[model samples]
Structures are given as structure tokens and as C-alpha cells.
Target chain A: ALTKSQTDRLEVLLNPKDEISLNSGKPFRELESELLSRRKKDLQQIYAEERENYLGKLEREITRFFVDRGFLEIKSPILIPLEYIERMGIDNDTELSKQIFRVDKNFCLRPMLAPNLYNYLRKLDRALPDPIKIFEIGPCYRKESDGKEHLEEFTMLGFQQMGSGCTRENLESIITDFLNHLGIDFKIVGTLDVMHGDLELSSAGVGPIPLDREWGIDKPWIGAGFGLERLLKVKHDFKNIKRAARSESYYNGISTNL
Target chain B: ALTKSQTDRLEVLLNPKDEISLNSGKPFRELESELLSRRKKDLQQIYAEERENYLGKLEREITRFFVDRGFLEIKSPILIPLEYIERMGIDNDTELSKQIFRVDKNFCLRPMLAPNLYNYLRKLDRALPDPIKIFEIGPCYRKESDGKEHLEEFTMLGFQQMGSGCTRENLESIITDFLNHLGIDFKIVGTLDVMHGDLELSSAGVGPIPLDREWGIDKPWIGAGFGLERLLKVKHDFKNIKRAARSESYYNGISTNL
Candidate 1:
């Protein structure tokens, strides 16, 4: 039997004009089930519309933030040679490497955009003017175990700065500025594996720091990566990561089943 | 052993200021080969920078055009269930299906954004306000046979409009307006399958035609898709499609090796 509060909540989901006789002797379990199903359908519709609007606003604001600051937006390949990851210290044995979805014996779906950006930084070092900044937003793949916060294919927004004026603080500022603009409430909760453990939503770090030596990047720089779905998940307080993902099952972040 | 014209061309690539004494007993074949190699390197550098600039400009223009017209930009998944394609009439025997790079037995990398967009349209049809317009710009995968105009992975810009105020002409106008704004020369060269074989570099189409019937879209609608690399190829007159593809071998849009 549903509690009185549960019945009230279900009433809010259903129409007042619709007949719902609590005293009519219908099994409370069946009544509760019917109400819950209808509530989910209603929620799905609202969620779909709201999520799309939120996504568009967030993307535009983030893009503007970087572009205004002179960062060049780049589109990198999703399929990369295995060797690119190896250069970044991820070999066949690494946990990250094992998560990649292989395209063939020679190539795999890119697990991150950093390798591509790093390659460009190295090649353009000689010709590009100093303080090169670039950003890319695209889908990244991983063979992640299904979880409330993980997805096999997710959108990643990654940015990198090379040469002078690229600092850890500066990268954090870019992230914070965008987050603030989007009106999302977040706290700097400490370090994660990739970045400085900055927050639950993102990671930022200084590079040309040992690991980047192989890429021939000698100057200090800042790089950060953010999961778009995770941002939406936190922003909307979604119960599941799939709500913020791209799926036929979920249209505009709303589950189609109801 | 070489014609005067050939020797002069070689000289131009080798020494703009220094004299090339062909009669100094160097074999003509070696001089010609050396000159060609150097020429390729110089061309590659120029192409890389120019291509990046062109790509950036085109993306900004197209994005602005859609936004100004009240169309919401969306980011759909590049990874989708294989069943989504099958529902769109793509079966295992279809040419399009064969090109999909499967993530596993159940899912495959999305070859097109139509399925996702269609799913959204169907679910949102009743809930969304009338005259819904949406577009997405992202990478799509296909196990395309390597050729002058094909790549295994490519970027696609797809747009769709549904409900009242959606017409075939409005869709065509969107295409022509953006193409003209980009200063691309194109002609409505007839149909090749999806778009009106319109090739300034890419294609565009109006829908609510036969394809919509399959998706159960009963309303009038329009959609168009474009290949970003193909646009660069046609605009720059690239001899090879790889010149406009994403690759370590090619930087910007130029081959790194001479």
C-alpha cells in the first residue's frame, strides 16, 4: 500500500478530473502502480523539453566563453591509431587503454581528445604564434561498466593551452567562468586522477609536466576535460547518467518508456 | 634528358634565388624528384593553415545561420543501438548497414544522425511546441572504402524541421542561404539519393517525402546533411579527399610528408 504522501504525489501527476476513488476498494498496490506509470510518462515529457533547452544554452555559453578568450575550436578524429595513446603513457596494459573500443588491429576509438591536441601542439610549435589555445567538443568512447555515473559513449569538452600564459589557475578560471555563466552550483571538492581533483564535474591540470615530455612540449600549459552529460546530470539532479546521454530509449534526456 | 619547361618548374621549387645549373651533370630524374618533394612540403604547410581557417569560418557561419532562424542546435549520440538503423530500413544487406562499425553485438557507431533525430521528433511531436526545428553537428562513422571522396569516419552536419511552418522551400532556402553566405558556388544538380545533388562541395535536401513515411513522421518536414571535409575539398580544389580528412599524416588539411 502506498503511504498517504505517496498517494498525494501521484494525485499531482494525474488529473484532478480523472476518477481516483481511494475508498473504492481497488487494491492499493494496483492503484499505486497505475499512478506511478502515469507520473513517469508525464515526467518524461517535461524532462525531454527541459533538457534540450538546457543543453543548448550550456553549449552556446561554453563555446562563447572560450572563443571570446581567443581559443580556436577544433574538431579532432574519433578514431585514432593505438600509438597516439602510447605516446601519452597509455600502453596496452593500462586500464585506460583496455577500455578503448578497438576499430581494428591498428586503430581504436579515441578514448580522449588530448592526444590529438597534443600532436597538433607539437607539430605547430615551430610555426604557430605563442600562447596557442584550442578547444574541442565531441563524443569519446570507453568500455565502461554500466553505472549511475558512467557511459560507454559520452560527450567530452576538452581544451588545451600551449606556450606562455598557460597556467593551472587560468584553466580553472575558464572552467569556473563558464560554470558560473551556466548558473550551475558546484564546489571544488578536490582531485581526481587526471586533473588536480578540482571537482566532481571536471578536471584541470598543468602540462609539460613530465608526462608531456615525449610530446616535445617544453613550455608549461594548462589542460582540462569535462563530461557534458555529467554536467547535465548534476545540474538537473538526475538519478541516472543515462538521463543525460544520447539514446533512442531517451529522447532529449527523457526516457521514452513510461 | 628533361624538357626546358620541366627544368624551369623544378628550379622554381628548389631555388627561387639561386641558379640551378642543370648542365652541372646532376641526373635530371634526381633533380626532378628532389624538386617535387620540396614542392609537396611547401604546399602541405600552406594547405594546413588555410584549411583550418576555412573550416573554422564555415562552422561559425552555418551555426549562426541556424541559430538566427530560431533553430536549436543539438548534440546527438554517435553510438546507437543497431536496432535504430534497422527501424530506419537499413538491414544487414543494405550498403549503409555494412558500413557501420559495431561497438558490440547490440550497438554500433551511428552512421547517421537521422535515427536519433527521428526518435526525438516522434516522442516530442505532441509535447513540443509547433514548428520544431533542430540541428546537430558531429562526427559520424562509416566503414567506407578508402577513396578520393570517402573516409571511414567523417563529420556530418544534419538539420531537421517538423510541424506547421515546415516546408520544402524553407529547407532549401536554409541550404542556399548558408552556402551563398559561405561564398560557395553550387547548383541544384538533381538528386543522388538524399540531397539535391547540389555540389558546391556538399548536398542538402527537403523531406516529409518518402523517407519520412518510414520514420512514421506524418507532418511536413525538411532535413539536410553535409560533409564538412567534402566542403573543404571542393572549395580548395583538393586533389585527394585525405587532404581534408582528420589524420596525423595530414595536419590542418595538408599531408605532412612531401
Candidate 2:
């Protein structure tokens, strides 16, 4: 029987960013030693090129995709008023409030992009053209567990379009176009936990439902908030989602810290 | 006495970035409405200039100071090995080990910048010029208290020098030079919690003691780790340290959330 300590080291040894999984079914000690030696060989090679990694590469490509499609990019405040959370119907008593980090009595680190995006959705109310397209790519914090796919602070790619043509069909085409742009395809399960190869790459759909009235909004909307980390996870068959983030722990899905 | 809910609103109303505190001895409702009116007027005005924020401004100036004095900036892995923590003389049973976040058994989100900085400090050992200098300005995560001056995720500016002149006097002079570059000064207290204006800004002094053996380094060195948030706190009398970070909560030390 193996010690509890060696089990963790073996788990990390099996998963690499670009390479396929490691499984020889050999003795655990021999497998660990070989993989560790391979890791040491490449550590110095990748150290210099880390200036540009997989996370940044995805960000740049996504930014270009939106710009080419005529969508304007916006940067929102990461810290927002408590009213924004209440506007989303999650009060101090709700399950979401548990995920919300209230630095003090009146302010919190935003748990999602919806509250701020909705603020802009209503603020630009019929003042601009027929359809207003805006997108934001930034970090959002949550009190999520340190699970396989959850990050306390992670990047979110939120794109929203509001006007007459924001039907379910239109939303589907756009999602396909965006996902395919990354050289990937997603499964559209009726269930919410849906995306590329059974993983949930994004929370996507048409809006302007009963929740619309609360934000003083009436226009139909096609909105999708893509978890960039999850999207990369599906794109790479990534076992550890942290590798796909703007992390000091990994670069280009490869473990740098270890 | 006022109810607890209104007290949260009042706490927000009392703290404004540019303006002084709001205290007129007036009734709660009267004061709330007046302050709310002032806030509404500026919301649309500052919405445009959120592009260039105080956090970014501070990062730029600090970066320039180090570059002017010949310090090479390096970015290290955020997810470092468990052994790095052990190198600092802390194990899974130690107090600092609690402040650290272990996403998995083998890896943890770096609680401090010391381990990686020390890694490179030793890597360049005698291989580079006599006085090899390096610094890093990026995010460092910890299970820190969300207190008046603590942030769970914050920015750290770490700079170190190794060579013959790496004495106590040399470290202080460099500290003075760097602080004065930002048009500020710090007080060196005998106690470890030392910095400027009785508030700790930087953990500084000469090194090359017993701990050097753990990292396989024997060269004399002078190192200082500055919490940029605390430095900004003293610089602007910042009441809330969150406002000084790479934040979406406040811009230019002003409340964007309220």
C-alpha cells in the first residue's frame, strides 16, 4: 500500500497541459520518477516564453473575434454597490449571498457579471442604435469551493446584445460562431450544464423574461457569459481548470509552480 | 437609535473619496437623500474616465521607479510547490500554513512572494554580475482577513539585491530612495511591523542568515517586500485599503460603487 503523501504527487504527475494523459500501469514509484524527470527537462525551456501563455492567447483571440463582429468592449467596476446584488434578487439571505464577498456593510466583490451588465443594458435604454452590442472580459470573484473547476477569482467573458432580433435561433448561431472561432464545438444539451463534450463552457440563452422588469428593461437580449477557464478546459481536455487561468500556478495549461 | 440596515447605508455615505466626511448632526433620512443626490450627479461624469484608474496609475509609477534604478522585473509562478513553503520553515502544521491555500495536496496558491523570489535570487547566484537585482509587481493570494487594511488577493512589489554592499545601511538608503521617488517617506521602527506613519508598508532589512542554508544560498542580500495597498494608504490617507488595489470598487481613491 502507498502512503497518503505519494498519492497526491502521483495525481499531479499524470496531467500535463499539451500532452496526453500518462498511464503505463506500471509500479507507482517508477512512474513518478520518470514523469518528474521529464518535467524537469522542459522547465527551463518554457521559463522564457512565459511572457505569452495560453490564457493571454485566448484573451487576444476572443477580443479580436468580438471586434471583427462590430461589438464594443467595456470595462466594468469589479467592486459594485450592494444594490446591484439585490437587483439580481439575491439578498443577504440568499444562497448567492454566501458566494458574495461583502468587504464591508455596503460593498462587495462582484460574484457575477449580470448585475453590472444589466445596469448598462438599462442605462443605454433606446438612446443608441436599434441593437446595442457590448462585451466585457475581466476577473470576477466568488466564494466558490476549491473544487476541480472552481476558482475564487476567475476571468469571465460576458457578451450581450439587445434588440428585436435576439431570438433563441439568433443566440444559437452566435454561440456556434464564437465557439467555432476557437476551433471547438459545443453540445447544446437542454440542461444548463451544457457545452463542449459534456462540460459547461458557458451560461448562454435569450433574455427579457420576468427578471427583465426588475432592471427596468423590456428589450429582448441574447446574452452569454463564458467561463474562459471552462472553455479552455473543454478545448484542452484539461483535468485541472486552474491551468487555463491567468495563474501563477500554471502557464499555457502546464504546471509551472511544481 | 437607527436600525442596523440604515447604518450600512450611513457608513457608505460618510466616506467619499474627494470630499471630506459627511457629518451635519442632521436626521438620517435628510442626510441620506442629500448625499445620494451628490453621488448621482457624479456617476455619469466619472463613468467615462474609468479607463485609467488609480490602481493602474500607482502600478505604473512604481514600475518606473524600479526600472530607473536598474531592477529587472520578473514574473514567477503563482502555483508553487509545497516544498517552497517548507523551505520557509513552515509545514502543513504551522500557523503560516493556515494562511496558505492548498488547492490540492502538491500545490498551493502562493501566500507570499518570498519563495519564488528566493528561487530566482538563488538561480542568478554568482552567474550574473556582482550585484544581481530583480523585482516583481503582480498579484499574490493569501487567506488574509478582510479587515480595514487586509485584502484576500492583493498586489505585492518585491525587490531584492545581492552582493558585497548588501548591508543594513545600503538597504535603508535604497529604501529611502525608492520611497522618495513616490514623494513619500517611511519610519523604521524597531519592531518587525514597521513602515511609514506607524502603519507597516514594507518588510525590509539585510539577510543571509541561517535561512540561506535552506535555499542553498550564502551570498549577503538586502530585500524589501512592500504592500502597495498600505503604501497607497499612507500616501493618500486612504481609509479603505481596497480602494488602492487593482479594484473595480473604487477609482482614483473615490467610491465608484456607492
Candidate 3:
């Protein structure tokens, strides 16, 4: 949760352009429309410039980490064929297909990378002696309406291995090592023994599909996922960051120490 | 494309639990099922044993890389709220939301890590450090129905940074460095140029949209996304690995090397 001051700052950030709706207020007919319009352009420029810089810095850092990982980054096609998706048991008019970019060819930007990677693999006729590991960093499209945390097109860094004898344990170890390598610490939340065990292999059903229609799956099949954002919000609850910047102690705060 | 023999071999290796249904007229049914089922179990045991060995070696290699690079690996929650996604301008759909198992509040299994990593940074109150490199390797889920290459439950390796100064040149340098470090000689594929510029973004329009008719993006303004499997296939072509592994006399006679 953000403090009032923090919320205020965010409000300012959110509503940078203070262009008023002229039709809402009286005397609008007598007001100088030119001045109002000029103000709107000025605010927009200021907002765009600031937002661009902020996002640019964040994106750069993200890209650097991946580039250092030996991933031969490439892009996957967004427009995919239904025949190909059907091979994976996906068909046109299906929820997944509809959520993607659909056209005559059932085109949709990939929701994930498996299809795109497989498409590339199928194009060739040879085998490699070792596993090939690569990374794909790009925007994946989803069919959904808006929210602060959800975007129709969000950036994703997807790395996959081929013919390298990949395994579950290996995947676990890599994640553990990656976090430690980043110098971040976290707690492993454990569930109740019976409760955890029960949930581990229960087959509820597929998403969007009703309970009666839910895919009956095994317990081992469904695993819990984590949210980095919520976890961070929890972890960062120690102090109010927005207030610190205004105080004389801002420069010498604990954030600097961190 | 795989040779008939190779395809058969892969099927045997991948799905040893089931027998291929051949067009040949059927005589054996229950008896074949019982006998072959036992054989498949045995073969699965053997494959699992071999897979363990391969994974063990790969884990060591990957770990060494992280250890040398000073990355702190951490486990992120798989379950996240639709709010986190909505904030990014993406929508909350059943495909992502339903598959996410709820605990108490509106948390669902996390499908990705970048959002959580951002949350981690905020939690730590750490200023964007220069070159904050982190990695996360784990299973990411999707409601994949069924297919040869599709795994509803598949492993993912993600690397990210928070406050590092990001730039296009910096990104390219990082890519080159990692490839060189890993000793993986790869042919570069311009994913951004091919997909976005030539495909989606190339078209001067309102930009891509989701099924719910939302707009805005959450990826690098411009970049490429490479497919790992595709890389392997390309390598296969460059090395002609199949021809090299075929029956020597026949392979030699068909090759220019003969």
C-alpha cells in the first residue's frame, strides 16, 4: 500500500496532462481555446519525455541481464497458423486463438514461445550434438481489458533449451542459483502437509472451462506460481519511500545503504 | 523434418508408455496392451535414469556460470493477482486467472517473473544498481491442451535487472558477450526487424490489440525475440548433422565429401 504522499505523487504522475474538458465548465465559449490547447501539448511532451526516460532505463537493465546469459536472442512470429496450433490441439474459435491476433489464417501474436520455437525447429532437417539454449525477449499479446498491472502487450524474456537433456531438477537449480546470483533473499512458504499433498496432484480443470468441464488433471500436474510484485510490496513495507525524498535525510536514507 | 526411422526412435524415447497405433490390421489388443505397457514402464525407467545423469551435468555447468557471475538466485511465487497484470494494461482472463490456483485472497500461480522481480526491487528499496543481473529458472504453466511439442507444464529460465542503465548498444554488447562466454557460435537472426518492423508494427495502424480491445505494450520499444529450438535447427543445417550420423557408406556416397 502507498502512503498518502506517495499516492499523491502517483496521482500527479498519472494525471500529468491537466487539460480540462472545456465543455464541462461555464464560460467555455468565451475562454481562449488556443491557450488551453497549447497547455495540453506542453503537458503531453513533459509526460512523454519523463515516462520514456524512466521506462528506457528499466528496459536497458532487463536486456543487459539476458544478453550476459549466452542467449542468442531472436523473435517469434505473432501471426501463426491454426493448423500449426491444432497440431497442439488448439483450434480456431478457441479461447486461446481468439485472445491472439486472429485473421483468415487464425493469426494471433504468440501467447507463448513453444509454437514459435517448434515452428523454427520444423523448418530444419538436421540434429545437433548438444542442447541448444536460446533466449527470446519481446512483447506477448493477451486478449484482455485494462488494468495497472495487466497490459495487452507486455515484455517477456523467455529462454528455452532444445536437445540438451533438460530436466526438472536442472530447472529448479537454475532458478535458485539465478536469484542468489542477483543478491536477493526470500522465504520459501510451505503449505500444510496433507493440504499441500492433496493440492499437488488434483485435476480440477482447464481455465475458463467450468468445474463440470474442467480438465481432470493429476495433483502433480498443478504447481503454485509466485508474484514478484506482490512479494516485493510485502517486502518493501518497512518504510515510506515517497516521504523520504522530501526530508533532509533523504540522501543518507537506508535506501542508499541498500 | 525427421526421417521415419528417427521419428520412430523419438516416439519410442519420448512416449515409451504407449504403443504407436499402426494402420496394420489388428489381431492383438488386450494382450498387446498388457505386454507393451510393461515394456514401456521398463524403458521409461531406463530413460529416466539417463535423463537424470544428463541433467546433473547440465546443472553443474549452469551453476558454475552463475557462481562466477555473482548472481543471487531466488524462488518467486507462481501465484499472482490479476491486479498485477491489469496494472500492466493486460486483462485478467480465465486462461491465466483460472489456471492460477487461489489460496486465500485473489492470488494465482505466477506465469512469469519480471513483475515479481520489479516487486523485489521495490521491497528492497535498493536504488537501481548498475548492471543488476538476476536469473530465475522454473516451471511456467499455460493451458496447453495437447500436442507433440506442447507442455502445459514447461520449465522457464528468466533473467532480469531493475536499475541498470539500459541502452541498445549495451544490449547488443551483452548478447555478444554471453554467446562468446558460452562458446556458442550462432548465426544472428534479427527478430525485431523480422517480426515487429516487417510484420506487426510495420503496418501503420492503431497498433496491435487484444481480444478485449485494449492497447499499450509492456516490452522493449524495439527488439528481437529468438527461438531456441529454431537455433538448434539452424545449427543442424549448418553442420548437416544428420548426414554425418547416417550409415557411413550410403552417407558418403550421397555427400560431396565422398
Candidate 4:
């Protein structure tokens, strides 16, 4: 029988990298050598160590595509005032609020980027011309399930255009244009979700929404937010969403834990 | 007398952009117009709306610098196992643990990148050649002060090289090379902080550290972690660190709240 330590080692050997059972009769020393060898092979495949991380490269590629289309890219606050949450209709007593991670009395890490984007709209309504285009890609925090599909801290990409060129049909067109650009065949539900293979990769909407008037903006706008990892998961067929995320537990198709 | 809302408007008018007080006798309507005008001007200066964000640009520049020098950049997980924390000698009852933002029974968002980097070291030490070079730029979470110099959620860049070329002088050389690449003039504290003007932008150290053995890593290594916002803060001389961060409250040279 294997000791607890050796058993643990054996489990790691059987992780995503290996599909067959190990030679149980092999010497413990030999199995350890295989463990070391697997680590070496996994390290080499950690997304072409010398190249830019695939996630980052994808991010830049997305940025380039949007910027080329005149969408202004902005980096917004990760820590946000709870007032923004209230603006999002997620009050203290709400279910969504239960998932929020508060840092202090007034602030919490952002759950989404809309409130920040909305703030931009109000600030720039008359400052810029019609069809104000803006986008943000950053991390959001939540206290939710410990599931493979969900991340407590996940990356989100939000892009919104207000003032002019906001129409319901345009929303669909924008959605189609985006996913098509990424070579993804996605279907949209009226709930604003952009779905790919049963996973919700994004949520989108158009506004002079009732919420827009509260931010004191009167212009029509179209917006969408994507889960970067979900998109990567669907595209790369990662067995778990964590494999597509910025993670210590998993990297480039290898996992730290069994 | 100004209504609470008007006073709020007036305060927004005074934030960072304007140098003079509004005329006391001016009609509220006129002041509102000025408010509108000022917001427009501020929007214009929000780092050239057509260009990439200055913060993201700086991040990429840093990435380019390191990658150009043979550093292999990796994207690690933001949420990590608590066992990794105990590995750092931060017990559940420790003050440092108090600073961590826990999400579930086993995980919390990483407070720093060293643990993940160290994990990389352990898995890759014998797998790779001597002098393994790896780096990560990602967000870390902490329950820190709502102060000008601290952020509860922040971006960090951590890089570690293990195996060969491990020397105390090499640590200094690496630090100098990095800051100089950014055109920053910095002085080091024995505490591992990379300081510029009064801010600690990074922390660095060399190890075959006692902690290394704990991770099953035996190679000598050197590593450093930088606060991305702090680095931008020092380089741009932003009045507050938040000004340089991904923030809705502030951007370019203007602020949302007075």
C-alpha cells in the first residue's frame, strides 16, 4: 500500500496529463522520476514559455479589433463605491448583494463595469459627439459557488456605445459582429446572455434604459459584457473554466491539484 | 443657498481640473453650464480617448521590457488555496491572514504573487534548466486601508528566477535594470521595497529561502513584485494612487468626486 504522501503523488500523476493507470508494481523511486518528468513536460507546454500568454494575446487582439472600430478603451476602477451597486439595482438585501465582497463601509470590488461606464456616459454626454463608444476589461469580485465554471475573481469585458447609433436591431447586429469576429457561432436569448455550448459567455443590453435616466443620461446606448474565461473555455475547449483563467491551481492545460 | 445636490455639483466642479472658485453671484444655470463645459474639457483630456489607456500602456511596456530580457510571463490565478498562505507562515490567526480576503473554506484571492511564483518554482525546478525565469502580472486582493497609498484590490507583477546566477548583487542588478528600463529613479530599502519619491512600488528578494524548502523547492532564486498603480503613481506624480489606477472616480487628470 502506498503511504499518504505517495498516494498523493500518484493522484497528481493521474491528473489531466495522464489517462492510463500507472504501473502500481513499479518502484516508488521510478514513479517519483515520472512525476518529475511530467512536471518538466508540463512546464514546457505552459503556453510556449517564450511567447506572450495566450490570454493576454487574446486580450490585445480583442482590444485591437475594437479600437480599430472606434470603440474607446478605458481602464476603470476595480474597487467601486456601493452606490454603484445600488445603481445596478443590487441593494444590500438583494440576492446579488450576497455575492458581493465588500472591502469597507462605502466600497466593494466591482461586480461589473456598467456603473463605471454609465458614469463615463454622464460625464461625457455633452463633452463628446454622438455615439460615444467605450469599453473596459478588468477583474470583478463575487462570493459565489466553488464551481469549475465560476471564478470568485473573474475577468470581464464591457463595451458600450451611447448618444447615437443605439437601436434594438443594432444590438443584435453588434452581438453578431462581435462573436462572428471571434469565429464563434453563438445564439442570443432575450435575457441578454451570449451563449456558446450551454455556457453564458456574455450579457448585453441597449439603453436610454430607465437606469440611464438615473445616471442623468438621455442618449440611447448599446452595451455588452463578456466573461473572458468563458469565451476562452469555449474556444479552446478547456475541460474547466479555471484552465482559461489567471490561475495558480491550473496553467496551460496542467493542474496543481488532483 | 445651494441645495445639497447643487453643493455636490459645485464640489465636482472644483475637483482637480479647476483652479478658481465659481463666481458667487453667477446664476445656478450658468454654473451648471460651466459644469457641463468643464466635464467636456475633462473628457477631452482623459488621456486621448482615441489612444490606449496610459495605465494599460505602461503595463504592456513593462511586459515588453521583461519579455525582451528572456523573462517568461505567466498568468496565475487570482484566487488561491489557504494552505498556500500557511506555507508562507501566515497562520489563520496571524495579522497577515486578517488582511486576506477569503472567499470559501479553502481559497482567497492572492494577497501577493510570491506564493504562486514559488509554486511554479517547485514544479519547475528540476523540470527546467538551472536559472528558471518566470513572471506574472495580475490582480491581488487584501483587506487593506481605504487610504491614499493602499488599495484593497491591486495589480501586481511578480517575477522569479531560480537555479543558477543566484547572488545578492544579482538582485540589485535586476532591480536597477527594471526601474531604469521604466526611466524611473529609485532607491531600495533593506525591506525589499522598491521606492520612488515616498511610495513602495515593488518588493524583491532572493531565496533558497526556508520557505522554498517548504514548497519542495531547493534551488536558489530571486524574485520581485511591483504594485502597478504605485509604479504609475510615482512615474506620473498623480496626487493620489487612485488617479493612476483603473478607476471611475478619477481618470486622465480629473476626478468624479471632489
Worst 10 residues of 2 chain B by lDDT: B44-53
Q: How accurate is candidate 1 locally (lDDT)?
A: 0.67
Candidate 1, which CAPRI tier?
incorrect
Per-candidate Cα lDDT values, in order, are: 0.67, 0.67, 0.35, 0.74
**DockQ, candidate no. 3:** 0.04
- Comparing candidate 1 with candidate 2, which one achieves the higher DockQ? 1
- Candidate 2 CAPRI-style tier: incorrect
Cα lDDT of model 2 overall? 0.67
lDDT of 3 by residue, B1-258 (tens): 345674443332222224555433443443345444544444334323322212112323443454355433433444356566655444555455444323235543345554554453343323333334444443344444554333343334444433344444544554555446644554333422212112111111111224112212322211122222222223232222222111111111122110
Candidate 2, residues A1-258: lDDT per residue as tens digits?
555676667665555443533345566778677666555445433433232345544655786687567554555666567788888888667878778666446766677888777766665442345576767776677778788788777778888888878887777777889888887777766513346655677877677788888987888898888888887787887787876765544545544434
Error of 3 at A63 (Å): 31
Please state the Cα-based DockQ of model 2 relative to the true two-chain complex. Answer: 0.08
Model 3 lDDT tens row, A18-54: 4544344444223334433443444334323321111
For B76-122, candidate 1 gives per-residue lDDT tens digits of 67878788888888876789968888876788878888887887677
Put down candidate 4 lDDT per residue, A195-229, tens digits, no spaces: 88687888888776677777878878888999888
C-alpha lDDT of candidate 4 relative to the true structure: 0.74
Candidate closer to the true structure by TM-score (higher is better), 2 or 4: 4
Report lDDT (Cα) of residue A68, candidate 3. 61
| DockQ for all models | 0.20, 0.08, 0.04, 0.37
